[PDB]
């Protein structure tokens, strides 16, 4: 999907502290770019059912990470939901 | 694409029309329009010669360049427009230094694409160039038959011939019917298939919609009287009581080959279909 | 970023003056749209393993290109198909 250099700017943007890659703000943000990339791919290759299956797993992972973030603190959930455009 | 009307009326159940989405300007040009007064099957004497032709919506003729001969000067596609006198669409083109003229719209010609007539032209959709310079295997429309006359062969929605090979002064071309033939090399074509590929899938529905293109009802011959048609007469409905189905004027109609023999095109048709 | 090696075969009966006219122009598209051709080698008239359009021999040219656009190599194949001099071509992504 997204290139390694592309991924890093997403990491730098939403990192909580420096040297942070596993927080549920960068993981969610990275998946959002990855999800949109596969969504754009499937606009052309509509019957890529095997690729679409991996998209549904990414959506589930982000959904579970968003549920965890909301259950931890609502403030960070609200900031992350508006910056990324997630409804 | 095709839009399927909802069955709000019976006379409109299975109707379908063209979505007219490829069209971009819905109005003509005052200087490339000349008058077309409907003739309705009538001749120089005033007698019905061809039948099933009559009243219909007025139409202005749009002068088309079937002989794409502006060689060297480039042209921009300004608007793909609707034509009432043909199945395919037309595209206004503006030449690189002021003149503008209509052509036939290829399949995926887009607004703002560039097209070139000539002989040094590339092989891209829309550009016209002689059949000596068109590679073997290319889909061509608007093929001339005579040097300088104008495209004649392959001009209706979804018409495409394939340049299949060479001889000497003639190129081999498989026309849409399935016929392989030869056309002089100094004659021009245009790269690509003609658009409105969905023109053949439309359903008319209304009797009146068929009676808007200038069609008039056609009566089956098996109900005219013996003095009107060979299949006419009989007390009741009758089968065709002759060895062969016949035509109004007395000439076999289910199989008889009506192509004049001893024609000067016979040496040029390789295999034939239809 | 992406590196391509393009090998194409020219028919063995081409006029010598036209050979440099074709090789020049066809390495010309391979340098367009961000392409920065590195190598452009000639392999000479070698024997083909099988007849290609009733030809037993042919000129081999190998051109290595590098560009993150990929349209230079697609433009090559579009014109290589049209041209009657090139009888076989192949584009390999080298990594």
């Amino acid at each position: 999907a997204i290139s390694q250099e592309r991924k890093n700017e997403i990491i730098k943007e939403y990192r909580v502290h420096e040297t942070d890659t596993g927080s549920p703000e960068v993981q969610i943000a990275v998946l959002t770019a990855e999800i949109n990339a596969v969504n754009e791919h499937l606009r052309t290759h509509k019957k890529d059912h095997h690729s679409r299956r991996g998209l549904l797993k990414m959506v589930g992972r982000r959904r579970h990470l968003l549920n965890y973030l909301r259950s931890k603190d609502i403030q960070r959930y609200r900031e992350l939901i508006k910056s990324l455009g997630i409804r | 694409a095709i839009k399927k009307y909802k069955p709000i009326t019976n006379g409109r159940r299975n109707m379908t029309s063209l979505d007219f989405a490829e069209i971009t300007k819905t109005t003509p040009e005052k200087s490339l329009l000349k008058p077309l007064p409907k003739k309705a099957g009538r001749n120089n004497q005033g007698k019905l010669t061809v039948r099933h032709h009559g009243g219909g919506h007025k139409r202005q003729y749009r002068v088309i360049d079937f002989k794409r001969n502006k060689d060297g000067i480039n042209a921009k596609v300004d608007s793909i427009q609707y034509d009432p006198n043909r199945s395919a669409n037309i595209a206004l083109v503006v030449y690189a230094d002021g003149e503008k003229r209509y052509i036939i719209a290829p399949k995926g010609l887009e607004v703002g694409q560039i097209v070139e007539s000539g002989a040094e032209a590339d092989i891209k959709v829309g550009n016209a160039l002689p059949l000596q310079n068109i590679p073997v295997g290319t889909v061509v429309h608007n093929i001339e038959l005579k040097p300088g006359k104008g495209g004649q062969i392959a001009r209706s929605a979804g018409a495409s011939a394939q340049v299949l090979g060479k001889e000497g002064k003639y190129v081999l071309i498989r026309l849409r019917s399935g016929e392989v033939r030869m056309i002089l090399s100094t004659c021009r074509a245009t790269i690509g298939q003609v658009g409105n590929l969905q023109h053949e899938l439309v359903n008319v529905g209304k009797a009146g919609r068929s009676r808007w293109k200038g069609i008039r009802p056609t009566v089956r011959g098996s109900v005219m009287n013996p003095n009107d048609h060979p299949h006419g007469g009989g007390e009741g409905r009758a089968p065709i009581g002759r060895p062969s189905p016949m035509s109004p004027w007395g000439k076999p109609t289910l199989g008889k080959k009506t192509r004049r023999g001893k024609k000067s095109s016979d040496k040029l048709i390789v295999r034939g279909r239809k | 970023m992406r590196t391509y090696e393009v090998m194409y075969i020219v028919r063995p009966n081409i006029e010598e003056d036209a050979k440099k006219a074709l090789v020049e122009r066809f390495n010309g598209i391979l340098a367009t749209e961000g392409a920065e051709v590195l190598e452009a080698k000639d392999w000479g008239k070698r024997r083909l393993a099988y007849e290609i359009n009733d030809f037993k021999d042919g000129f081999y040219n190998i051109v290595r290109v590098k560009s993150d656009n990929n349209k230079a190599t697609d433009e090559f194949q579009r014109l290589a198909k049209i041209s009657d001099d090139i009888i076989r071509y192949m584009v390999i992504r080298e990594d």
Binding site: - | - | M7, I9, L48, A49, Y50, I52, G58, I62, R88, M90, I92
Partner: protein, 64 residues
Amino acid sequence: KVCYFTANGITHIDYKDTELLKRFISERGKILPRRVTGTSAKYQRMLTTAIKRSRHMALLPYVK
């Protein structure tokens, strides 16, 4: 027996190297089974790819 791709250290079989490939094409251009040539499974795959690329570019015969 020894692979010749692990023994000599070749980590990239090139389809332009026709001479190296002609050792695995037998008498027809037929790809020789790896049991006969003793190359490993990892190199039988990239050698098959190189051979098929050479055949298309007429550097190796399909049949002989």
